[PDB]
């Protein structure tokens, strides 16, 4: 199968934001909403904002899984390289092979599915601290796009699921991830080919 991604609000508003970061050479994360589009460097901080329009119930909770974004790829799970896979970098709770990790969240959990064999990553859905009108989730990519035997240049999508606690869909968005070596230029660059 293949999953679904379909921005879909729902009753609660649910709908990603991203920081603007600009396109300097040294930047390590940087969102292109002409492409809608995320480039960024191996293992560095992605701040995905997650905004609503009305606190949905306790027990919501945010999954992030990837998909290649070329249809005669899509049925093929997005994982690490045989490299990457084995570098024995793991943060003690996300397994090798999981190409999306969440950093600083100690009740994120790591999803094989059993039936799709696709990998997630999921954490509760959290209130806005005092001060603040959304909550951000920092993820991390652990391969490069062009890692041979992995994604090997092939594009990607994250798709982020806002879901009730039995996992049932209460809203969607995604976006395409390009991870490479230099965001700042290769967003510049695609910006440019667009125009
Ligand atoms: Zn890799």
Redesign the pocket.
Same mark, same amino acid.
């Given at each position: 199968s293949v999953p679904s991604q379909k921005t879909y609000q729902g009753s609660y508003g649910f709908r990603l934001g991203f920081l603007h970061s600009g396109t300097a050479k040294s930047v390590t994360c940087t969102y292109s909403p002409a492409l809608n589009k995320l480039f960024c460097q191996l293992a560095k901080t992605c701040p995905v904002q997650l905004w609503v329009d009305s606190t949905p119930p306790p027990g919501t909770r945010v999954r992030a899984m990837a998909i290649y974004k070329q249809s005669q790829h899509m049925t093929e799970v997005v994982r690490?390289?045989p !490299? !990457?896979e084995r570098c024995s970098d793991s943060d003690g709770l996300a397994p090798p092979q999981h190409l999306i990790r969440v950093e600083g969240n100690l009740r994120a959990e790591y999803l094989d599915d059993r039936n799709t064999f696709r990998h997630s990553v999921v954490v509760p859905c959290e209130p806005p601290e005092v001060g603040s009108d959304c909550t951000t989730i920092h993820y991390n990519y652990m &391969?490069?796009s062009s &890692?041979m035997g992995?994604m090997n240049r092939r594009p990607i999508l994250t798709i982020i699921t806002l879901e009730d606690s039995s996992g049932n869909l209460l809203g969607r968005d995604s976006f395409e991830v390009r991870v490479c070596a230099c965001p700042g230029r290769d967003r510049r660059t695609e910006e440019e080919n667009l125009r």
């Open positions: 690490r390289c !490299h !990457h &391969c490069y &890692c992995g």
